[model samples]
Target: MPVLENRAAQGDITAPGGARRLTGDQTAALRDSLSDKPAKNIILLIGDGMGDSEITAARNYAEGAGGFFKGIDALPLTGQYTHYALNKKTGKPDYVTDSAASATAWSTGVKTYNGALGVDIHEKDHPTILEMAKAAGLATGNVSTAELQDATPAALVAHVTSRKCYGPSATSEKCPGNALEKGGKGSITEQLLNARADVTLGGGAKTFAETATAGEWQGKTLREQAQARGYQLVSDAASLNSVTEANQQKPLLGLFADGNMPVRWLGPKATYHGNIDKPAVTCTPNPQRNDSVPTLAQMTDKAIELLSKNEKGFFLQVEGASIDKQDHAANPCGQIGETVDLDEAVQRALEFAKKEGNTLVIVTADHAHASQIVAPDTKAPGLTQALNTKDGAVMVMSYGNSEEDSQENTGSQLRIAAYGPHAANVVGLTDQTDLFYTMKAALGLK
Candidate 1:
C-alpha cells in the first residue's frame, strides 16, 4: 500500500489531461484488488504482445462513436504501467519487452531474457504460481485464443529454455526461433495433456492429430492420451456447452482451431473481421456440432463453471492472444477490438466471481507492441486530433514523440487503461517478478 502511496504522491497515475483526479476510495479500491485473498478463484487475462496502444486502439474501435473500449472502460476501477525488458542481444536495459519475457515475469516473478518461458535463463524449471496453487489444492485451467502451448498461457504450467521448444522442436535440430519443437518435449500440446489441465481450450489441434485429416492437423496426436487421462475432448462452441457437470468429471480439451482462435467480433458464420485469418478459422474438420466457436466470453464462463467444481480453489487463465498480433499488422481498429474481446472474457470471469466470492482476477499484458498515444489536445473535443496521422485516420502513435515536431520523433508515449480488482495497481511500474507475489498476495496464496 505504501508503494501505491509513493506512486500517487509522485504523480505516476495522474490523468493525461489532468482533469480526472482519482479519489482516495478509487485509489484504495485499485490497491485492494491487487492483494485480495483466500480467493475461491484466480483468473488471469493475459494480453500477449499487448501494449498501451494495442488496448487503446482496440478500445476505441469497440466503443464505436465514443472511442472508449467498453470492456475495461466499463469496469469500476482502472490503472496504467510502463512495460519494458532487457534486450536479447545487448542484454542491456530497454523499454520494449517481448511476450515470452513479460509472460515469464507474470508466471515466475522474474525478469528472464527473451524466449524464456517461466524458467530462468539457465533453462531450469521452477514451480509456477498455478502449479503452486494446484499443489495447495486448487483446480487449474488455461484458455487462449491461441494454441494451448502458446507462450502466454503455456507459461502458467510448462517450462523449458525456449518458449518454442514444444512439438516438432523435440526431435529436430532445425527449430524455429520460437517453436516448441526441441528436446523431445513434443509440443506444448503434450505438456497440456501431461498437466492434465482441468479445462484446456484454444486452437492448435494439429498437435493432437495422428494423421493429416483434410481440416484436422496431421502432426502427432494427443487426443487419445487426453482421453486416456480421462479428458472429455470437445471442439468448437456448441459441444463446449454440452460439457455439463453430469459427464465431465475429468479434464477437458477444447481445440477450436489449428492455430489462433477467432477474433472478438466473429460474425454468425464464425467469419473473422481482420486483415488476416488463420487456416483453422474458416475450416472446421471437427467443428463442435454447430458451425461456430464460442466467444471468449463463453469460454471464460464455462471454464470457471467446470473448474470451480473442484472444492479446492482454481486458477484460470484467459487470453486475447491476437491483440498484439493485430497491432503488428498496424491495424489499430483490429487491435482495439481484439483487446476488448479479452475484456469481454474478463467481464464473464467477474460474473463467475460474483458466485465464487473470492476470485482474484488479474489482467495484464505480456509485452507491448508498437502503439503509442501522443500529447493531448483539448481543442479537438474528444481529442480525436491527438493521434498523429499522415492520412485522415487518427494515427495512434508509439515511441513517444517529443516537441510538437522533434527532429527524430523519438520517445513516443503510449496510452493504456486497467481495471477489475487491482488493475489500477498493475499498470504502474513496480517490479516484474513481483507480479506472481502480487497475485499470490491478493489471494493469500502463502
Candidate 2:
C-alpha cells in the first residue's frame, strides 16, 4: 500500500475536527484483571507544569529523596505523552503548549492553538468530557485551586476563542465573538453556568460579581444568575462541609476566594546568583490561608462525596493550578507546596476510586516547566535558589528558562499515570489527545 493509504489505514485522528474513537488493538494486553473493561467513574487529577524535575524536587523536600507521595506516585501504569499545540496560522506543530490548549486536547480529543479552550485550531466548538458525561446521564464535577475560569477547569465546560474571557466584561472586550450580547455562548462564567455540572469548586468568585451583559439575567450579577438558575452556592469550608447533595436540579458551586487561592507555603524566590549569597532556607506557611479557605484535598473529598450520590456514576477533574504560576514567578517554595497540595488531592481521589472498584484515576500535567534540580552551589545565568530539604543538606534548584525574571514552559513530554479499568492504555508512549480517547472508551461514551 502507498504511504498515504497506510497512514489512513491506522485511523488518522485530526481535531474534533473529526469524531474519532480509539481502536481496540492497543488494549489487547489489558484483557484480564478488568483492565480492558469500561469504568463506572473517572477521576482526572492535573498537576499543572509538573514535569519530572518538579516531582523529583518535591519528593526530595517533603518525602525525602527515596520517599514517595502516596497519591501522586501511586498510579501503577505510567508513560510519557507529547503535548505540543498547533500553530493557528500555520496549522503546524508549535512545540510548547499553554494549559488551555493542553487541557482542551484531553477534554475533547482535539489539539488546538495555545490559549484556546474547548475549541479546535479552526475555532470550532467540541463536546468536552464533562459535557458528554452529562449527556450520558452521569454526574460531573470540576475543581481547581486557580480561578474556576482558568484554563484547566474552563476547558472541561466552556468553549471560547480566548481563555482570557473569564466574565461578561472580558468577553465584551477580548472575546467579543463569544459574548452573550452578540448571541454567542458568553464568558467562561456564563458558559460554566450553562454547562451545569453537578459540582464546581474553585476560586474566581470575583468574576461572578460581574453582571451578565445579555440574557434572561441580563441585568443581574453572575452570582445572582447562578442562584436564579437553582445553583446551591457555598463560599467557605464551613458552608462546603454542610452541603450534602448535588445534581442537575440543584448543583453545588463553591468559591473559596476572589481570585486564585493563596498557596500553602512561602519562601525566598530564586534570584540571580542568590544560591551563593544567601543561606539555605525553609518555607513558612502563608498567613493568608486559614480554616475558611478550603484546601484542594478537602474540595476533592467533598466533590467525590456529593457526586457519588448518583447511581449512574460520575466524571471529575481536579487541578493543582499554581504549580505552573509559581514556576513562572521563580518561587520554588510556592510551587512545591502546590505540588504537595495536589498530591493530597490525588490521594483523596485514589482512595475513593479504590473503594468503588469501578473508578479510573488518571494523574498528569499540562506541560513541563522551568524548575530543575541542580547542584547546590552552581552559578546560573538565570535564577537560582538554595533550600534546606530532608537530608539536612542544602539543595539548589534552577529556573533558567529565560533571561527575563519570569520563567517559562518547556516543550518536553510529560509523565502520565493511571489506575483501574483501561489503565493499561497509559503504559506506553502516547499523545495527549489519547487521554480523551482512553477516558471516552473507559466510560463507554458514544
Candidate 3:
C-alpha cells in the first residue's frame, strides 16, 4: 500500500500515447487489492503459432512418449480467443496477423499492423502492460526461444515500426535505418537494454554481440550496454543456472544463440545439451545440439526466481517460439517437440501458481499454424509430391502462411487456458486483446 502511494505521487507512470496514470477510485482499488491479493503476479505463456492441431499432435506424441497429456489441457479455465487485427494498409479486420501485431495487441491492448511492435496503427508508442507493471513497483520479464529482439518479446518492451529494426548495426533488411546509432531508441536491440525489464532471456547473441564475422556495429555492443546498466549477463546454461535470487535483484540478461534458440529436439546427438549446431541447416540425422543452451523450463524457472524477489509481485512472459518456425518449415516432428517443451513450461508455471496462491497463469497462442496430421495408409503407391498439387496421398501436406487471400483462419479458434484469480475472465469466447484488459483488471492496474 505504501509502495502504491509512493508510485501514485511519482507522476512517472504513463499509458500508451502518454495517457494519464491510474487515479481516484482506480488507484484506490489497486491499493485495496494489494492488501486483499486478487492476483499478485501474472505469468503469460505463449505457444507461438500453436493451434488445436498442434496441441493434438503434441498431446498424442507425448502420450506415445509415456505421458498421458500436456499440462496445458489440465487448466480449469478453457476458451477460444479470436485473433484478428485491422490491417494497417486495408484498415479492415484481418485474420492473418503476424507475431508483432498480435504481441502488440496483448502487450498494449491495441491492434496494429503485422510488423508493428509496442506502437499502435498510427506508429505512436503506447505504454505496455509490462512497462506499467514495472512503474507500479512490480518486476517484469520477457522470455522467448526466439531472438530477444524478435517481435514477441520486443513488443512487450520496444517500439518499432517494423520488427526488422533489431540492431545497433544496420542491414538493408534487418535495420532499415541508415545512420548508425548506439543506445538510440530507434532500434529494438537498444530498447532491450534500455526498456528496463528485470529479466530478459532468449537467443540472438548476434543482435547483441559485435564481431568482425557478422559486420555488426563497431560501437558499444548490446551486452556492454546491458552490463553498464547494472545487468548481469549470462549466455551459457551454467551461468544461467548459477544466477542467484540475491544477485538477480539486479536486472539479468541471457542470450543463448546467435539466432533463435534450437527446437527442443535439436540438441546434441549424444546428449540433449547445448546450442543447435545445424547451419543454414535443413534436415539432419539427429535433431540435437552440443552447445550449452538452456531449456525453456530452465529459463522460466530462473526468471520466476529473480522476479519473485520483488515483494510487490512480478509479470513474466515465457514463449515457446519454435513451434511456428518449424511449422513454417513444414517439419511436423520439430513442431511437436517444441509444443511439448512449451507445455512443460506451462506445467512449471502451474506448479508455481499452485504454491504461490496469488499468481495468475495464462497459456495461449499468438496465432495458429495450419499444420495438420493425416492418417498413415500404406495402400497408396509412392509418388513424388509437388507443392500445391493435389496429389492422391494421406496427408494434405501444405505449409501455412499469413497470405491475404488465404481464407483459412489458421485452425479454427485458438484455445486459451488460465489458472488462479483471473481464470474466470479468460473463459468463454474472447478477443486476443481482451487478455491485456483482463490482466490489467486482475492486477488492479486499470
Candidate 4:
C-alpha cells in the first residue's frame, strides 16, 4: 500500500463538509492545513442510489412538517454530479447507470460501462483505492447492510461481469456463479481472502462459507484463517466488544449475517435489553431474511471502534446498500426506514469522528432512484417534531399505510435526507461526476 497523496483535481470538485468554493489559493490553504496532520482514519459512507432530490424527499417525508429539514437539513454545503456512465452504442434506459459502474468509479476512480466492477468494461485490471490503501500498509475494512459480496461492497476488491455472481463465475468465462468454491479459485471471495483486509463486516456469509466444498459449517472454518493471521474475529456486538478487549493489538473482523443483514422492520421484536434479537427465519415474515443477525448500526459501531485503533491510518467503507433494493421493489416504508437506519449509522460515524481527530468523513449517495418526496401539510400540531412525510405522517404512517391508502396518499413520493459528513451536499447537485473530486478534496485525497 502507498500513501494516497493528494493530487489536486484538474477541475474544481466540490469539497466535502459543504465547501463549494475552492480557488487555487483556497485549495492550497486547505492542503496546507493538513500538511502536518495526517489522517489516522478514513471513513467513507456511500448511500447507494440516493440523490439530492431523493434526500430532499426523504427529509420531507421524515419531517412530516412544513418547516424543518430532516437530520441533514442543516449541513454547511452541498455538491451534485452527473451519474451517467459512458454511453454504449445501444444501451437500454435501464442500463444508463448502475451500482457496479458507480461503485467502480469511487473504488477505482476510472469510469467503466455499467455492470463492470474493478475491471473496466474491457476487463482491464484497475486497482481500487481500498486495494491501494491496504497495500500502502493501512488497515482497510468494508461494512454494509447488503451482502458483503454485493457490487457496492465487492467493488472495493473484486472484478466481475454480472454483479450478482459471487463465485468463480464472476471471474470465469464459463462458470460465473459457481466461483464460490475455494481452490476452485478466482471468485470475489478469493480476492477478498487474498487481500487480507483488516476488517469485513456485514452479511453474505454464504459466499465465504466453504460449504460449497465441505457441506456444513465450513464458513466458520474459513473465518478461522483470520484468527490464524492474528486478526480478531467477532460475529455480534457482544463478541465485537469482547474480541476488541481481549486482543487490542491485532486487526478485527466481524461477520454479522449469513446473508444480507436484517432490516429494521424485518428484525426481531423490540427487546427490553436494548440488543436486537429476532426470531428464526422460519417464523419471521420475510422468508428471505436469515435468523438472529445483528443490526447494521451495531456492526457499524463495532467496526469504527476496532479500526480507529490503527495508529498509522485506516480506511473503512460503510455502505447503505439496501436503500436501492427497497426502491427497486417500490416499497416506500422499507426504503425510507432503511435510509433512516443509514442516518443512525451516520450518527455512529460522527461519534467516531469526535474521538479520531484529524479524520475526514465523506458521506454521499451513488445515484438517485425513482422515488420522490412530497411536502407535508402545515397544519399538523407536532409539525416541529413530525417525521418528514406528506400530512405529518410519522414513520409509522409513512411506512405503515396499506398499499391502497399509501398509493392514494403518496403515489410515488420518496424521502431524501443526510445527517453527517456531506449532509449539506445532499442538495444543489447541479452535476454528479464532480462528486468524486469533491469527496477527494474534502478527505484531502487530492
Which numbered prediction scores highest in TM-score against the true structure? 2
Clash totals, every prediction: 38, 0, 11, 44
lDDT of 4: 0.54
Q: 101-188, model 1: which lDDT tens digit per residue? A: 7777777776667777766655556778877776677788788887776788778767656666555434134233223332234345
Candidate 1, residue 378: how far the Cα is off, in Å: 18
Q: Of 1 and 2, which scores higher on TM-score?
A: 2
TM-score of each: 0.72, 0.92, 0.77, 0.67
Better of 2 and 3 by lDDT: 2
lDDT (10s digit) by residue, model 3, range 1-446: 11122111123324442223234455554333232348999999999888887786665454431123446765656789987877787778877788889899989998898888887777778999998998888889899999888888989888877888777444334545321342235577776666778888998888777421122334566676667668888889999889885233478888888898887654211101101122111223234544487889888988888888889899999999988877765555566678878878987888888788888888999987766544332121211111111122122223424333221326356899777776767778998889999888889985
Q: Score each candidate by Cα lDDT.
A: 0.57, 0.89, 0.70, 0.54
List model 4 lDDT by residue over 1-446, tens digit each: 01112222333234443323223444443333232344556677777666554455455455433323322332223344555565433432233467778788767767777777776556576877777777666667788888877888888878665566564433454334334443333566655655667777777776665422322323444565446656666666667667563122465556677777765543322111111121111111345443445566666777776666666567778887777676555454455557676767766766666455555565677665655332332222110112324543433112222232221111121222222333333345433434444344444453
Once fitted onto the true fold, the runs of candidate 4 whose alpha carbons sit more than 4 angstroms away are 1-40, 66-71, 87-95, 169-185, 211-231, 245-251, 266-293, 374-446
Q: For each candidate, C-alpha RMSD in Å?
A: 9.3, 10.0, 13.5, 11.2
Against the true structure, candidate 1 reaches a TM-score of 0.72
Per lDDT, the best of the predicted structures is 2
**Considering TM-score, where higher is better, how would the candidates rank from best to worst?**
2, 3, 1, 4
Backbone clash tally (model 2):
0
The TM-score that candidate 4 achieves is 0.67
Between candidates 1 and 3, the one scoring higher on TM-score is: 3
